[PDB]
Amino acid sequence: LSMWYGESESNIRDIFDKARAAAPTVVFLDELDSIAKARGGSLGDAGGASDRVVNQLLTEMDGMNAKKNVFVIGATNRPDQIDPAILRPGRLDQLIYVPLPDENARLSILNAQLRKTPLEPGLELTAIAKATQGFSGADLLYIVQRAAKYAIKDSIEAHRQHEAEKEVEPEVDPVPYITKEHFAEAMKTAKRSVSDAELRRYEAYSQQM
Amino acid sequence: VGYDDIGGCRKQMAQIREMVELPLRHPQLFKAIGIKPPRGVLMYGPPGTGKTLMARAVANETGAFFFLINGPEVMSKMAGESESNLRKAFEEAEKNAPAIIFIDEIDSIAPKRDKTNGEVERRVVSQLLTLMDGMKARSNVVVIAATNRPNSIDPALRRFGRFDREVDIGIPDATGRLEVLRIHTKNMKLADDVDLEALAAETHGYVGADIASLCSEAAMQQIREKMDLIDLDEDEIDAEVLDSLGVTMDNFRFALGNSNPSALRETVVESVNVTWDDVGGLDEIKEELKETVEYPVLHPDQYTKFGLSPSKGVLFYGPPGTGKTLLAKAVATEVSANFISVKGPELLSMWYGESESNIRDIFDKARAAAPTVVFLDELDSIAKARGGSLGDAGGASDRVVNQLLTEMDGMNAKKNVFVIGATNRPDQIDPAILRPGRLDQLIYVPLPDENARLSILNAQLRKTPLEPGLELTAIAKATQGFSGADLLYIVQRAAKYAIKDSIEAHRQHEAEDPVPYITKEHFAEAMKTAKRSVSDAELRRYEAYSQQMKASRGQFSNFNF
Amino acid sequence: VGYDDIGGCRKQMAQIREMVELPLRHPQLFKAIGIKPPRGVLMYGPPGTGKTLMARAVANETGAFFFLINGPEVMSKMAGESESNLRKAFEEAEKNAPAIIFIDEIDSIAPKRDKTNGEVERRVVSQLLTLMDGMKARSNVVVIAATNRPNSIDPALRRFGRFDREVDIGIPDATGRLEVLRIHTKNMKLADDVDLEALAAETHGYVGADIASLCSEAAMQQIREKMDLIDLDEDEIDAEVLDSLGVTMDNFRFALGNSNPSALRETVVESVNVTWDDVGGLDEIKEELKETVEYPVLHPDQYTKFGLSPSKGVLFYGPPGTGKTLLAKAVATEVSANFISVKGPELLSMWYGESESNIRDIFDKARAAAPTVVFLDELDSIAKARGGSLGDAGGASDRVVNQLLTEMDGMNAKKNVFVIGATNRPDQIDPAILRPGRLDQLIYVPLPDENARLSILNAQLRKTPLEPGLELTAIAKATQGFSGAD
């Protein structure tokens, strides 16, 4: 978007020209609640610029034949504010819902986030998967990062203790793995990400669509 | 100036030096490999990195011919003279010897041929495209170009044959800054106790010529410091001052505390004078915030040994007048990270897209001179809920909060960005910003108790003369629902009563130092018109939000494995 | 014009004069230390501070070659002529001697290369950026620039080598205004009874260039006083009156009372005429307001000895028709600080963020020419609590409240900003703005009793003829529920 006249549509025009030039490609339109905003026609607006943006995106997305085979990917947080003119079958018809993780998906998230980490051999993640029911991957990453921060603080304390006892020898790191006490201390302030009413709104939208 | 002066960008220097020297020293290797070497390189990056110094070292090292072409130096008033000047420059670079052409500031030469409205600029771009690639294009000559913005260059000029290799000379690392410090301090006698390694590890956003500015400011402060024992000496400074000058470490510390990076000169904040002991109470919150800021900027080796990215955001919320802005000032005044301060509705504008452009420019300046720490005060003005207003300005605050959500988590590298939120009402915040990954540390700053109000009263009365018999235990025990703003109001009313008594004693002494400290009667008269700031309903609302956040922490126990 | 003419900015004067004078008198210190001195000055600040006077003194005393360049002076209608003019100017400055180049008003030849839309401006920016620091850039020449706004400059032009040391010639202090008064009143036959210390102490928010306007207005007032009594003699003026003219003290007092700072000329308050003796009753409220206003103004030494910041805010709430606006007018007449007044919805606009820009500009103008006192009338209008509407009007009143809370207590210096608020509805006020640091004194102005009723009856009847047998005690005792407006 630009404050000048014509540039706010010329940006979408030459971005889609660069997409049509390097075929095939993938155009990831992130956060479509700012481009494909709902109109709400009540005779009062800022002048009709978002309408021109939506119309330019519609006439630049309708000229997609079997040639040049581009693909447009969208990902929004609020699906209620998306235009039904851009959610029309024939222009953008697919709708994949990404739900909250289950027990096995949560265990897979906890196993994939701990790939390149020196984990303890006597440590299991099934208790973390079972004790947390309405959690998500972002706050699970927050839990793992707080455990890593506690392990780094313990390493710094052991290093300054070793320096004090040397000035007044352990291994290359006194805490070579993330212990269970670090996870038990990191899960003390482990809140959840999403509330309950947002899940009700997403379930209502999934039942409507 | 040789190749031992642009250290810190050794990879890009080798990438340039290969395609300049190897098809010029021994071209038999390229004649035996079968094909032609690349004959084009475009330097792009931030200003003050060393691209012009690298081109000058290229012109000074090789013994071949060198032609210098500036940006707007080719333009002329005659109709058809800039193309003739370009053709004559290319013919002089091709006819004499295999030469190197340097095109400095190409942004005034290539206006991308789709946004300009003139004719001479398009003629110059078409002449450059003709002379760079075509029939009788180039006969064993190379072209180098330097610019500040790479996006304002023509896509036909950013093609193979004309400019195929785009070297990226970015900001240096700590070892690069140490190398630049060792280069710029090799022609001067500094000290026997100067530490360039700690100086390189102390700076965080300096790039290129800023280290030379630091060294020149330290030397200028040393010269202005070592000129007070002797007079002005307008005739001649004798030989006793010329020898054994010395540039100690205190000059470098003063020049480091009295300077800023060249990219963050626009958003420089006023230096408030607080310390960590000025913020009374909040010991665990202060320690957790201080370690969360200082851990990834001092020990990155443990963070890449564990293989995880550090935490970035932290949000303070609670009753107003508690110490959120004071904690932000204490972070701004003494922590080694660069500080970009911004108010809530400050970055808005009446045009269409200028608010999102200002948000993108603020975040780009934050991630440019990384590590920076950002203080987004009053998030409830620009970052509200989405879809809550029926009548609006065409959906602009939704675009603002979408730009904030995208810049805080998107297709970014996320090198080192520490955003700080201090909002006195956490209800109007969007639920997608309180998600971890953007703002994970939701720190509730509660009201002080009897053990914290005493420390607040001790920190607020740090730089004042006080009565030796006066105690603050009765003041900490009498007030139970008070705050730090109320204690500051009590202290200010006691100081106003002491100033009134002092000026009354001064007027009586002038009619016919009387008050050396604040007595007990001043505090007893100041504690009569003192009330609490927050009421009982807002405290109940904050405890209800805290209990809702703790109910979001359900099914948690000792957690046996 | 010399170096003893720009007194008032000692640190900025020394910071300019160091790199101007020291690499020209004796370069042996720089030859021994090995490093090269900085060769760039950027003088930014408020308009009318002394940057052009500093450049003129540098041009007048330093014996090197000088070359002054105006802002839109190199611009020509030919394609490629402005850059040629800049190149010829720089080659003329480099050809003669080690010289000083003063490029004044650089906000017209540097539009940041991103917000502009032309091509000539970008080519002029590229010519300056190449000719100031490139290959064989500058052979012992120093560039000085002067600007009214430092933010609309290219960050590549705000770099080391081109413009590195940015001096801040800002708003002076009491001793700086005394130095400007002693400089500007050293050539006139002034008086034998005029003191400059009280004139420098009662002048608060002058930018340093209004002091000469003050002395010129005082001299013109004295000349106009001498021209009306004695005849003008339009053929030739009699030279007897020229030997005894002088400048008296009441001329300076009239010039002080008939002037204003140059930054507050757009928010000037209209001349109301009230008196502290014209506001009957409320003696404790009047003495508390006088204390709160005039303690950090008259005695800064006790506040900097105790090491504490003074209280600034005060709120007036109560029944209408009581004297809150009258107390604000009595403040606006005869305090020792400047006055900036607004109405309730006066600072609101229909665009997006223009009300925020108006709030930020009026608070920057209040804190720039410190000390000022701001009368925020109708805090019920300008500040709701938060989110009180079920359907929002675009989300703007909450942003106005947030900008008020940030400007009254945020990440600022907080030099001297007194906030006076007068409302008649304290239920719809934010508890975050009722909190100390912004508005701590919640002064309640009640209905008058019998003695306050008698004093307001004697004060409203101050300038009138009355019967000598008139007794106001029955009027003060019979009403017993009335107010000042009634």
Ligand SMILES: Nc1ncnc2c1ncn2[C@@H]1O[C@H](COP(=O)(O)OP(=O)(O)O)[C@@H](O)[C@H]1O
């Ligand atoms: N990477 C660097 N290494 C060493 N010195 C540098 C570097 N970048 C800048 N400098 C210093 O700054 C001076 C000017 O740098 P220059 O190349 O003109 O800037 P730019 O990076 O904008 O092209 C150099 O002569 C040198 O003293």
Ligand SMILES: Nc1ncnc2c1ncn2[C@@H]1O[C@H](COP(=O)(O)OP(=O)(O)O)[C@@H](O)[C@H]1O
């Ligand atoms: N814990 C505290 N210790 C010391 N002074 C405090 C404390 N809390 C508040 N104050 C004083 O009161 C002022 C108000 O605190 P501040 O951080 O500005 O409030 P808020 O949380 O509303 O942003 C501070 O600037 C300081 O002068």
Ligand SMILES: Nc1ncnc2c1ncn2[C@@H]1O[C@H](COP(=O)(O)OP(=O)(O)O)[C@@H](O)[C@H]1O
């Ligand atoms: N600090 C000062 N000391 C002395 N004279 C000053 C000062 N500031 C302004 N003046 C006077 O103000 C008048 C106009 O100032 P001038 O330098 O032309 O403007 P500016 O500060 O905008 O560049 C001159 O008569 C000048 O002498």
Ligand SMILES: Nc1ncnc2c1ncn2[C@@H]1O[C@H](COP(=O)(O)OP(=O)(O)O)[C@@H](O)[C@H]1O
């Ligand atoms: N306490 C008072 N003392 C003297 N005059 C008063 C008083 N209250 C009201 N008046 C008179 O009535 C007028 C109305 O008071 P004013 O301050 O304008 O209104 P308000 O009380 O609504 O702020 C005053 O201008 C003055 O002439």
Ligand code: BEF
């Ligand atoms: F990159 Be520099 F400013 F020439």
Ligand code: BEF
């Ligand atoms: F007044 Be504070 F910033 F909540």
Ligand code: BEF
């Ligand atoms: F030249 Be001044 F700063 F108006």
Ligand code: BEF
């Ligand atoms: F009507 Be008043 F200003 F209280």
Ligand SMILES: [Mg+2]
């Ligand atoms: Mg350059």
Ligand SMILES: [Mg+2]
């Ligand atoms: Mg605050």
Ligand SMILES: [Mg+2]
């Ligand atoms: Mg000027």
Ligand SMILES: [Mg+2]
């Ligand atoms: Mg009123």
